Amino acid sequence: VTGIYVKYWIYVCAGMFIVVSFAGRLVVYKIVYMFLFLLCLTLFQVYYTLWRKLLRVFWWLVVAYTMLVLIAVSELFSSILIPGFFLLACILQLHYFHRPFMQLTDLDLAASFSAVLTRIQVFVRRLLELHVFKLVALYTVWVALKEVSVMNLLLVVLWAFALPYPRFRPMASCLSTVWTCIIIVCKMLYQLKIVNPFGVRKGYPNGYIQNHLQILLLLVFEAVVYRRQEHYRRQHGTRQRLDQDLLSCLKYFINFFFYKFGLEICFLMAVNVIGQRMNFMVILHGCWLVAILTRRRREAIARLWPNYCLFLTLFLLYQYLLCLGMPPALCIDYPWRWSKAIPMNSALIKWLYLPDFFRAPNSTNLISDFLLLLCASQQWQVFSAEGEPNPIPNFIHCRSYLDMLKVAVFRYLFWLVLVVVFVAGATRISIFGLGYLLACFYLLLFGTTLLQKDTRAQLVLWDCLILYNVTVIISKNMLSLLSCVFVEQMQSNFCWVIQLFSLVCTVEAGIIWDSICFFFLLLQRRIFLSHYFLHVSADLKATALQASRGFALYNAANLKSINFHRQIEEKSLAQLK
Ligand SMILES: CCCCCCCCCCCCCCCCCC(=O)OC[C@H](COP(=O)(O)OC[C@H](N)C(=O)O)OC(=O)CCCCCCCCCCCCCCCCC
Ligand SMILES: CCCCCCCCCCCCCCCCCC(=O)OC[C@H](COP(=O)(O)OC[C@H](N)C(=O)O)OC(=O)CCCCCCCCCCCCCCCCC
């Protein structure tokens, strides 16, 4: 207990200070002073100016806060109790939990706990991108959803154009913390009962500042993790190691999952956002995806990556700005929505991503675009971060458990892809379904002969098929307009146009079979290039070289059987004679 108190002390003080909220209405003593002190301490910790370099000043400021609280001190039956408890807690933390805390800040379960803690800390530190990603998710899914307005666009923009540029990431994070503190102050200011009628607070439960508090808590947790990693670091290959057992391969993928499949995952996330949003902006996304994908060689992808990333981040910023525009203070309306008889209506203004007060554009899909941005930034980092033919004969045959998986992946997956293509084609009625069915049929008929072909024609035909699939994706995205904007009019005019395509409105979901088909096709395209498949193709060629002997052996067996029967009949007839 003494060690726990000496170690985990400041957290109790922070919790006690935070517990001072919901003190009826807004009182400067209740919030302003305490909230300002907590914000100053948190900002000092984030910037490491005092709370991580002059913690004596931190203790002095804690003592000063306790003195101010004392100077400040059923109406007062319970209100006079929380300040006393907070003062007592601060005095206790300053009595014994101050010097040992500063010093520390400068049974088979034991081994398991040690291993779990070491793995978690190593992951948080080395794979700091994961932490950054969690903080980004908590800073985007809240600002873009809860309070979509000014005073939250600054932090969103800062992080959005900090993620693809890690050189700006550290200071930007600190700036975000400062901005969060400012937002918190605003949330504390607007909660007062002195308003009486951008980004108004309108505090209902006075739970209306939980977003900024959670963002600050996540930032503090990330900073604490980084500081602990630095303290541990100051104190106290894999590819060849792949082919021993399943555990080694699992650990190797845990290490370098993104390094090899980042482009595939980014394409999959682009398809996912395309499916989820389904608008004109998505038409732009699809056009740019085909533009990148047309250049087949990876070096062209390297050349065109920075343009992709910059275009996508500026597109995200434009989307967020377009979400919040023309504040309702000026009662004038947008240059489109008049009382005129212009052909546009509510359906088209919903489809076309435009700001309208009657139907504000959705703000729970920017998350998918931001995830795509994160994938693109990680892949840009990977791009900037730049014998087996002996083993592969030995996985052509079976060993402990890695060989079975290798043969099931590099040999028995070319047919699962065809099965998935057939299922996708036959599970939804359209012209695209017929095209998928015909492609699957042709591939299945000419499977083995295609496998034994050289890599060139194989990649040519595979790229043709995947480009047809992405063309189908973009065509469905295009026709979603006529599927939703002009449902009744087109239905009355023509019902066969609704027959030939899936005209239902989508509004993970939507094009799911198509997405997995795209995934499997891209995976098989990647497989066709690895060395592992080379000697599987060699085995197929060897099987082709055969088939001049099986017929001979069947004939030999037939001759053996017929001659045995003949001999027994001759014995019988000799007996008869
Ligand atoms: C939400 C919480 C989840 C928590 C999960 C915890 C468990 C999962 C952990 C995830 C795996 C983490 C693996 C990290 C691997 C780091 C590799 C690494 O730093 O590269 C090696 C480093 C740095 O090389 P470089 O300068 O970039 O390039 C050198 C050269 N140019 C080249 O081509 O490269 O150069 C070096 O020489 C340094 C080598 C250091 C290697 C560190 C890893 C050691 C082995 C793996 C340990 C952990 C494995 C996973 C455990 C999983 C447990 C379930
Ligand atoms: C309720 C029903 C549930 C049904 C769920 C079914 C689950 C099925 C899981 C199947 C797992 C297979 C996924 C692995 C993905 C394979 C695709 C892939 O990664 O390509 C292989 C890549 C590409 O080659 P390369 O490393 O770059 O080669 C170096 C160089 N380029 C060269 O070639 O020169 O690099 C590699 O070659 C790496 C090869 C590693 C592949 C290992 C696969 C492990 C499979 C794990 C299956 C475990 C099943 C457990 C069953 C439990 C039952 C209770």
UniProtKB/Swiss-Prot annotation:
Note: Piezo comes from the Greek 'piesi' meaning pressure.
Membrane side Cytoplasmic: residue ranges: 47-56, 164-177, 235-261, 296-308, 452-464
Family: Belongs to the PIEZO (TC 1.A.75) family.
Region of the whole protein represented: 578 to 1346 of 2547
Superkingdom in the source lineage: Eukaryota
Tissue expression: Expressed in bladder, colon, kidney and skin. Also expressed in bone marrow, liver, lung, spleen and erythrocytes (at protein level). Expressed in myoblasts (at protein level). Expressed in red blood cells. Expressed in cochlear inner and outer hair cells (IHCs and OHCs) and vestibular organ HCs.
Regions crossing the membrane: 4-24, 26-46, 57-73, 76-92, 135-146, 150-163, 178-192, 207-234, 262-277, 280-295, 309-324, 364-385, 401-427, 433-451, 465-483, 512-528
Compartments in which it is found: Endoplasmic reticulum membrane; Endoplasmic reticulum-Golgi intermediate compartment membrane; Cell membrane; Cell projection, Lamellipodium membrane
Source species of the chain: Mus musculus (Mouse)
Subunit organization: Homotrimer; the homotrimer forms a propeller-shaped Piezo channel with a cation-ion conducting pore. Heterotrimeric interaction may occur between PIEZO1 and PIEZO2. Interacts with PKD2. Interacts with STOMl3. Interacts with TMC1, TMC2, PCDG15 and CIB2; the interaction may be part of the MET complex. Interacts with MDFIC (via C-terminus); the interaction prolongs Piezo channel inactivation. Interacts with MDFI (via C-terminus); the interaction prolongs Piezo channel inactivation.
Phenotypic consequence of gene deletion: Embryo lethality at midgestation with defects in vascular remodeling. Conditional knockout mice in inner ear hair cells show no auditory and vestibular defects.
Chain ranges on the Extracellular side, renumbered to this chain: 25, 147-149, 278-279, 325-363, 428-432
Function: Pore-forming subunit of the mechanosensitive non-specific cation Piezo channel required for rapidly adapting mechanically activated (MA) currents and has a key role in sensing touch and tactile pain. Piezo channels are homotrimeric three-blade propeller-shaped structures that utilize a cap-motion and plug-and-latch mechanism to gate their ion-conducting pathways. Generates currents characterized by a linear current-voltage relationship that are sensitive to ruthenium red and gadolinium. Conductance to monovalent alkali ions is highest for K(+), intermediate for Na(+) and lowest for Li(+).
Protein name (Swiss-Prot/TrEMBL): Piezo-type mechanosensitive ion channel component 1
